[PDB]
């Protein structure tokens, strides 16, 4: 039926509706460290999210997302291995059942608690639904969560879950400051990919951090609290909503850092 995380319409699955997913340039990847290439070329990351402008929070019934007002270059990522100006437009989460799972990209085989993924499309395109339509469309900043100390800044989101337990809620989100997500270090490896969920559009510049930022586990409780299905349906807790590393295949991972 409709594509989803389970046993009958999992990953696994995809590739019936979507055969992109068995493409070229498909997410997420493991990231070897060993393998991975510096380049002296790249650019530092230029993230200014200042003047961000939140407006909702939703659970679209794969994940939870939070909006922003993309109609001016108010939150903006520019630099690294980008060119132009591209908008964020909403950032979202991947987490497990367990600690030890949750993340889409690995380091090395290494699972993290959980990932954060901020989507910004490229301007030059006018429209995020053209830009998904082009290779150079999207930059998604992938952020991982360990647990350990909690996080500040993730409160406020952490806190009105409770009200979008179920798919197609949605609640007002105003005033969020997505720098209070962000690692102390920006430094970076990246490379060409896709999007990880259905239509697996490979339009994606991955840019994937270093430094895991630290959340506590009562946190990441909250986010396994949330349900994949609708009000009034039989409870599934939203769990383990990430896809598995895919072939890097004809791909090289560059990096920020030496
Ligand atoms: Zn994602």
Same mark, same amino acid.
């Given at each position: 039926?409709?594509?989803?995380?389970?046993?009958?319409?999992?990953?696994?699955?995809?590739?019936?509706?979507? &055969?992109?997913?068995? *493409? #070229?340039?498909?997410?997420?990847? @493991?990231?070897?460290?060993?393998?991975?290439?510096? @380049?002296?070329?790249?650019?530092?990351?230029?993230?200014?999210?200042?003047?961000?402008?939140?407006?909702?929070?939703?659970?679209?019934?794969?994940?939870?997302?939070?909006?922003? @007002? /993309?109609?001016?270059?108010?939150?903006?990522?520019?630099?690294? &291995?980008?060119? *132009?100006?591209?908008?964020?437009?909403?950032?979202?989460?991947?987490?497990?059942? =367990?600690?030890?799972?949750?993340? #889409?990209?690995?380091?090395?085989?290494?699972?993290?608690?959980? #990932?954060?993924?901020?989507?910004?499309?490229?301007?030059?395109?006018? /429209?995020?639904?053209?830009?998904?339509?082009?290779? /150079? *469309?999207?930059?998604?900043?992938?952020?991982?969560?360990?647990?350990?100390?909690?996080?500040?800044?993730?409160?406020?989101?952490?806190?009105?879950? /409770?009200?979008?337990?179920?798919?197609?809620?949605?609640?007002?989100?105003?005033?969020?400051?997505?720098?209070?997500?962000?690692?102390?270090?920006?430094?970076?490896?990246?490379?060409?990919?896709?999007?990880?969920? &259905?239509?697996? =559009? #490979?339009?994606?510049?991955?840019?994937?951090?270093?430094?895991?930022?630290?959340?506590?586990?009562?946190?990441?409780?909250?986010?396994?609290?949330?349900?994949?299905?609708?009000?009034?349906? &039989?409870?599934?807790?939203?769990?383990?909503?990430?896809?598995?590393?895919?072939?890097?295949?004809?791909?090289?991972?560059?990096?920020?850092?030496?």
């Amino acid at each position: 039926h409709h594509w989803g995380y389970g046993k009958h319409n999992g990953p696994e699955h995809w590739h019936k509706d979507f &055969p992109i997913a068995k *493409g #070229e340039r498909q997410s997420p990847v @493991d990231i070897d460290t060993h393998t991975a290439k510096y @380049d002296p070329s790249l650019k530092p990351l230029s993230v200014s999210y200042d003047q961000a402008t939140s407006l909702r929070i939703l659970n679209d019934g794969h994940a939870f997302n939070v909006e922003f @007002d /993309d109609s001016q270059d108010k939150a903006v990522l520019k630099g690294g &291995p980008l060119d *132009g100006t591209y908008r964020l437009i909403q950032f979202h989460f991947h987490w497990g059942s =367990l600690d030890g799972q949750g993340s #889409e990209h690995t380091v090395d085989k290494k699972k993290y608690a959980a #990932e954060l993924h901020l989507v910004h499309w490229n301007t030059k395109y006018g /429209d995020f639904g053209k830009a998904v339509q082009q290779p /150079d *469309g999207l930059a998604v900043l992938g952020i991982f969560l360990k647990v350990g100390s909690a996080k500040p800044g993730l409160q406020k989101v952490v806190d009105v879950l /409770d009200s979008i337990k179920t798919k197609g809620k949605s609640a007002d989100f105003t005033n969020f400051d997505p720098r209070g997500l962000l690692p102390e270090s920006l430094d970076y490896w990246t490379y060409p990919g896709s999007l990880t969920t &259905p239509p697996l =559009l #490979e339009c994606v510049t991955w840019i994937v951090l270093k430094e895991p930022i630290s959340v506590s586990s009562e946190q990441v409780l909250k986010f396994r609290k949330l349900n994949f299905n609708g009000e009034g349906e &039989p409870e599934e807790l939203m769990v383990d909503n990430w896809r598995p590393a895919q072939p890097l295949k004809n791909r090289q991972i560059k990096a920020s850092f030496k």
